[PDB]
Design a binder for this molecule. Sequence first.
Ligand SMILES: N[C@@H](CC(=O)O)C(=O)O
Ligand SMILES: N[C@@H](CC(=O)O)C(=O)O
Ligand SMILES: N[C@@H](CC(=O)O)C(=O)O
Ligand SMILES: N[C@@H](CC(=O)O)C(=O)O
Lengths: 304, 313, 304, 313
Amino acid sequence: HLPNITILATGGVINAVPQLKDIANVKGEQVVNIGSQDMNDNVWLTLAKKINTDCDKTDGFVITHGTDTMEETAYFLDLTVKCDKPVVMVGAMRPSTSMSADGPFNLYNAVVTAADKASANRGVLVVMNDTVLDGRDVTKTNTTDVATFKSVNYGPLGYIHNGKIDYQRTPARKHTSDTPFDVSKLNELPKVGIVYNYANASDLPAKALVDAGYDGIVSAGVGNGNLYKSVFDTLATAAKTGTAVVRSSRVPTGATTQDAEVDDAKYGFVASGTLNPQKARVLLQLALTQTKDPQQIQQIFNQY
Amino acid sequence: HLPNITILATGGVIAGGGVENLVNAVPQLKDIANVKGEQVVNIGSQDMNDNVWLTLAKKINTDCDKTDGFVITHGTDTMEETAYFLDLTVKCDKPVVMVGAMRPSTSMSADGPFNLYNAVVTAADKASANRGVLVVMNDTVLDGRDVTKTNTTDVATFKSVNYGPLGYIHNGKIDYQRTPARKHTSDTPFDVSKLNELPKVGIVYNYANASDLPAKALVDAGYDGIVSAGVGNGNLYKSVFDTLATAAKTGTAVVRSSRVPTGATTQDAEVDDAKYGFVASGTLNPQKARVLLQLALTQTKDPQQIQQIFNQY
Amino acid sequence: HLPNITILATGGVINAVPQLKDIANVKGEQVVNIGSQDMNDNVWLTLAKKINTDCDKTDGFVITHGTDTMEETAYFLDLTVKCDKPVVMVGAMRPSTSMSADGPFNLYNAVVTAADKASANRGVLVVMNDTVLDGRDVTKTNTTDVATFKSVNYGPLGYIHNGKIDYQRTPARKHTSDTPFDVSKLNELPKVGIVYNYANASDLPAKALVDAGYDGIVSAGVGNGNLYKSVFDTLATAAKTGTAVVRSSRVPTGATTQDAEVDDAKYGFVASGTLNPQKARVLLQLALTQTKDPQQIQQIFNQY
Amino acid sequence: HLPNITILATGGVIAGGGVENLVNAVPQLKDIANVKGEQVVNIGSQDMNDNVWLTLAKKINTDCDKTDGFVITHGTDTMEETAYFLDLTVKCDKPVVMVGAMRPSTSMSADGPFNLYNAVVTAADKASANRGVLVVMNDTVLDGRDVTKTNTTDVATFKSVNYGPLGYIHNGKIDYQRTPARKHTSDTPFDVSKLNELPKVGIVYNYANASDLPAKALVDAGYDGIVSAGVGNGNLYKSVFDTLATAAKTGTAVVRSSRVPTGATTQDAEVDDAKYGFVASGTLNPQKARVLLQLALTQTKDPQQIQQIFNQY
Ligand SMILES: N[C@@H](CC(=O)O)C(=O)O
Ligand SMILES: N[C@@H](CC(=O)O)C(=O)O
Ligand SMILES: N[C@@H](CC(=O)O)C(=O)O
Ligand SMILES: N[C@@H](CC(=O)O)C(=O)O
């Protein structure tokens, strides 16, 4: 009578939750054990492969992860997982040995989410603080708050009360099996770096990446993806010299749009829309497995 | 008797689609002030830089006695940075109010006119004094330390995301209910009157699989400081951590901030600052932490004194 | 080549926008002229009838309205409009004669929204401050701010930049032609009143309504729809005496849930979910045109 | 030397699923204070009332010299109301900190334990003094006037939605950056030491097609005041307006507030307060405007003096 749920563990600050046995038959597997500040491409490749391979062995997946880069992993899996069963990511803001630790109830709600049949076909989900959040818009909004995880542009899909979810939204951007990114045979990802804009910004980070032959650069622009003059110069050069350039923003909400202050087509640049720099990096890496044409990368940025 | 208010124009979308045309665009300003304008520069704030900052702060400090208040018209993109620099360096204790516009003056429902008006109202209010340098946008008075641009296009983008606004503006009047506690203006030791340049401080971003090359480049270039835009509570990808540990043992100041948009990068978390000679930025986001680090480095290179400065200002 | 758009005007603080001619052939009609603080049942009946009757005469509707009760009208139309062409509501926070008045660009964006073919089948929409918001979750969050209108539980559907909308969400709750509420032959609505909970609350408002024979009472509860003891007593009486009782909350976000501190089935009560008191009142009035069974009213509250 | 901190328990979900079991539930409290507990009542705060308010305020004022700080355990539902009443009536200038819990103590990841701890930390901090009565929830210190419950179930529900929090709590320490400007505690004229009851003030809601019957009922009952939960900027449906106009001309105090969850109900908007003898509530939401109106009516019935009180406190 209960669903089969596989917990895949990666570490982070998050048996000790026996009330799980009320809602699913849980099996645990250690994939890695790291703080997610050391999250990397290899871990991501491992996770997508495991999920895709093991899909027909379970009814859903919960991935325990650190909270620091949970938002990057959730979007990577959102674009590469082809399993059409729920994949829910979860962490904790307080250690398990601390007073009023969030990990037990968080895990419980993540299992609830992975077990719910209404959760399929919603893409990869993050479940934190009683809320089901899509892997594309979810981000860490505060450095220490238990309520930190929000979908700051388009909102949560669902709230969880008493083990039940009232879903009122689903992401429209294409995800999972509706994307072309197939990661099954890949052992590395294209090299993509992020540079930060501010007053009197150095061009040296952007130059270091270009000198290294990086495949992509994401700018964390000011305002609507704007670039400090030295940084602009160096990127405009990179984009005609073999490096794809995506303009995002350091600004924590809203789109980096087309048709603002930057002639994207003149420079061969791509506007990130609502993807923040770390998220744009995810979709840039995957675009680069398929194309290096900035027109075609911009299309990818317009659909996923 | 109306107050005398000086507008110092620097450019931005508010001056776009100089200063003398701005005033004539808002004649209602004559109802609340005698306004006089000076163009200091005319740049997009994406191109703001240490020299415009020194020029403004020197100018305000020099011209303090000649006016009753200052309004700075400025691009939105880096207004939060300029605001905090001026907050630490102006010694004038007449109000200094920054203002921009998120829509072009020629566009429908342009926010520039009513924003300017409100910035003047604020600079004319005797209660605006002794609150530090201010940002006035969308009917709201915001302190220069906490104010940040939250959204890429919304007219309401500017928010003090941790501690809230100082006061709200309705029908040309302000109900002030808050003032920043952190020391500002004439309570800081920072004196830029005889400074021709600022120490070099760069910013590096942290994410999964972060490259150390951007950090290495800034070390190779002999940077006086580096501000880390960390993950979560000021955390660093290992490669980045390692370059920044090595740098701090050879006299580069290293301040851990966070790419996360609200909350403090705290002391006593996952990083042993005292061990590496790193500084925790508190609620200062990376571009704000740069502002303070640059000024910290005019006084001191000691990591412990620099930490004390990040606890007071 | 341009869409036919009918502006229906009701008043509020919001020709003078000639740039409309770039995006549609606009026709205006005065239905009423009031401040929306005097919005009433008759105006709503008029509006739904007009839209339904005139549906095949236009490509979309923009309704100009005051901002005070725009959120109540948008949900009423959201449940009663059977036209499957966009119906967009719009107002202004600043008078048209004031500096940097929001009405021109707001109207422009509302027309953009009503003209967009992607806007059909999304229910009744409110467009304010560059944002397309669903009529069920949208509410006035601040007394004076131009950015006041937000969908505070589930987020916007879409942002508008340079005359274009990137839609990433649509409401899941049933709306428009997927609801049973047919208003075409009705000339009045069931009488529904709202009472407020706080410390030491008087039962006198609730009693006045009951004494008046009201069909429904919405409680603006404390917390998770809780009721001051005197008010609870009076409502528990009303619910067994011919008055339907819906528990909402004065709290501006989140659900009044089932299975919390109030035994709803014991008392014959209905939990409002995410509907605030004014919105619950809308759906209560319409439920009462079809049923007075609290089990069946609770179902309606669970689907619309 | 640890400080002496008194917990006054009133009930709520934190005391649920008295006071002596609460302490034993949080033994770590012994690391930061000598705690002593008194049960004052044991009710859900949905049932909070004028008598519990008088009892708490009298008690705190009486017992001020016998302890170093007070923590009040309380239901979440009306904590914002109690907090503001105590903010206007306690004359003790040791910290007074309110705390509840949104999950039951028996539930997974119960917030009650760590909340209590933080409330004690706050009440023990000498810097918490002279800031008025405080609410401590979700690692955040909030002033009693602005604090409100924003969400029906979230552990982070409590926010000062207009002017922000006072300070944040990390590893048992507080960085205070704000204090309320509005007069509180020993700067208010409100003295409830010899009061056996409070004036009668009710709340009426405004929406489309609003009934006047709830307003009429409160007038018929001879209410001393009525607080309107208005639409938008304190506006009233016509029937409601008319009953409340008639009432104010026969000595009922009428305060326009707003059902809208942030922002002020302003003077000089669509309602001519001076004409009807109405008062504008400012940022006080309806349940908060009641708190102040009740206390205003212990001093005065004049609409103009009551307006002045709504501008100062
Ligand atoms: N540094 C931790 C933070 C957490 O899990 O809260 C991690 O992300 O692995
Ligand atoms: N790029 C412009 C943006 C603005 O003014 O809104 C600037 O910062 O100068
Ligand atoms: N009282 C006006 C408010 C507005 O339109 O801004 C109305 O709702 O009609
Ligand atoms: N109904 C409870 C809610 C809580 O404590 O969270 C109370 O206010 O007493």
